[PDB]
Amino acid sequence: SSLSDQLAQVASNNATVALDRKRRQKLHSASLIYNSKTAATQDYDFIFENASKALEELSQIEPKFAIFSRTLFSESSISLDRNVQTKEEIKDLDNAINAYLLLASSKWYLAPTLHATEWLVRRFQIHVKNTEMLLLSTLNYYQTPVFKRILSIIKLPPLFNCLSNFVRSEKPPTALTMIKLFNDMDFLKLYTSYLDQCIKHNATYTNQLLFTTCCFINVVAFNSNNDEKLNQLVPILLEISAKLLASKSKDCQIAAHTILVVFATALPLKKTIILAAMETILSNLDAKEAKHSALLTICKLFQTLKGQGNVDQLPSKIFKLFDSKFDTVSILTFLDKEDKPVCDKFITSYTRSIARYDRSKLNIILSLLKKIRLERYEVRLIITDLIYLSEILEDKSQLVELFEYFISINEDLVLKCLKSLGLTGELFEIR
């Protein structure tokens, strides 16, 4: 290309190294704490000693920082220069920095981590070189003067380009701009990589997960009326949904339930992928809040299923697994909940599966059929499966009790299912 941009490239390459006094002070004056004319007279040992004090108090409030004392906040670290050593030890350096940054992603409400990280900024120059992990680790606190400060001193990466009119503006960046930051899969694959590192370090927490989930449902909201964009956007959100369920935290599990429920009501998925999602959210379900939320999200997932085969049998290994994680009386009291969420298609598939893969305890199906109301094709398919069951195994008092209940309400349904299969005289013969 041309000469001007051809060496603007090498200027951006060697922006980290100070070449004289003017660029040295224009590089040293970046700070998370002090302003320019104060920060231009600090030395390294001063900010190092107050940062080490900040670190040791931060390490007694969180016991996983003495390793960074031993290897990154040591006394030789003030002499360790970054851009004087080879690519392999700079790779060691910035993955250690990334470890520290995701570890200290939580603590940004309290000033010890500000004074702990400001020496890291001033010495290892993460505000120019290691900028990405810094931004998308502290992205949760976007209404805070720490984020306004760090965005005022940052050099802005090519991904976060929507924020470049929020540098040195007193207005914090707004939620709409955060959505427009999140609204391309070049950013989203990056952010899912970061969340994968947070999962496999268990550095997840209730505020980062809340913010992440809220921006993801807002991204799906903006891509509601773009079918090609939504189908383009599936295999990353569902990917970290499945990676989010693999962890142990109740909060990330119910965040996975949140993105799953909003995505299922966003677009109609297929039966095989929604069944894999159902068994996946069941296969790592431990805490009671996760039980409650997973039951709600399973019911809504199955409610947003259309086309034929919607109310069919869930198979045996997902059915017994659902019964292993959820006993029948939990289903009964959830149906006894007074809010009455619409769960008719899931309860229809549950009735057909308990009548086909257990065929033993029909007090359950009679009780919950009394407890909810249910629509006509659902009860037609239930009583068809009941006709087949009543002819394969011999009739019982429970079976004929629910049968005469379906006599007592809406006779011509079971009459027309007998017209499809036999005759009411033959059914009274099998009575």
Binding site: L210, S224, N225, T258, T265, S293, T304
Partner: protein, 48 residues
């Protein structure tokens, strides 16, 4: 009776509530210091 059972099949569907691009902007007002289960209940009540 096949179109009759098809017509009953399409009759047996209630009013869902769709999503649209300005339905979830209100969550950002109370993303602060809120337990995620209450967030899940909030997004489900704004959803249905």
């Amino acid at each position: 009776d096949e179109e009759d059972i098809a017509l009953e099949f399409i009759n047996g569907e209630k009013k869902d509530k769709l999503v649209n691009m300005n339905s979830f902007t209100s969550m950002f007002d109370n993303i602060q210091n809120v337990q995620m289960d209450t967030f899940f209940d909030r997004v489900m009540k704004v959803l249905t």
